[PDB]
């Protein structure tokens, strides 16, 4: 039950909001975590989602990692959403602070296309060091399902929208 979003394209929507609070008001089927390949949930969206599950995401993640080994950059896995959503799509964007290839951002957003509807942040745009505006551009050009983007910083939201109008 997404409310209050700005329509950017027929399938990309954006709202100035914290992703953990949206998950609670909207009860989404798929919340996207911006993850790293070991599902070690640090200080961004991944930390906040984990906090709200009372660390259940981290245990489940380690269990997944123990069985299956780490993800590839640009990949994903479908774990549980616990009290936030039905499912959590863990997606690993490139970490440009660690020399990974920004082109893999396209591979990262392609995982979204296996889900009809998702609530997501902007992959790689915080701790991983990609430009938010670039991340939004790849999102817009790669994702074909319905993606609802949560941008918690009001100034970044304004910047992002203004950047998108250079269409
Ligand atoms: N609670 C939040 N709600 C909405 N957007 C948020 C929130 N916290 C951060 N963001 C925004 O989401 C985008 C992604 O930030 P990160 O979560 O740091 O994502 P990423 O750059 O992919 O970092 C991946 C890394 O962060 C760790 O938490 C994670 O375990 C991995 O090591 C950025 O614009 C950031 O400002």
From Swiss-Prot:
The membrane topology noted for this protein in its Swiss-Prot or TrEMBL record is: Multi-pass membrane protein
Give start and end of each Macro domain: 1-167
- Swiss-Prot/TrEMBL catalytic activity: Thiol-dependent hydrolysis of ester, thioester, amide, peptide and isopeptide bonds formed by the C-terminal Gly of ubiquitin (a 76-residue protein attached to proteins as an intracellular targeting signal)
List localization entries: Host endoplasmic reticulum membrane
Outcome of altering residue 29 to A? In strain: Mu/B.1.621
User: What activity regulation does UniProt give?
Assistant: Inhibited in vitro by GRL-0617.
- Function, please? Responsible for the cleavages located at the N-terminus of the replicase polyprotein. Participates together with nsp4 in the assembly of virally-induced cytoplasmic double-membrane vesicles necessary for viral replication. Antagonizes innate immune induction of type I interferon by blocking the phosphorylation, dimerization and subsequent nuclear translocation of host IRF3. Also prevents host NF-kappa-B signaling. In addition, PL-PRO possesses a deubiquitinating/deISGylating activity and processes both 'Lys-48'- and 'Lys-63'-linked polyubiquitin chains from cellular substrates.
Provide the protein name. Papain-like protease nsp3
Q: Which organism is it from?
A: Severe acute respiratory syndrome coronavirus 2
Q: What is the lineage of its organism?
A: Viruses, Riboviria, Orthornavirae, Pisuviricota, Pisoniviricetes
Q: Which residues of the full protein are shown?
A: 1027 to 1193 of 4405
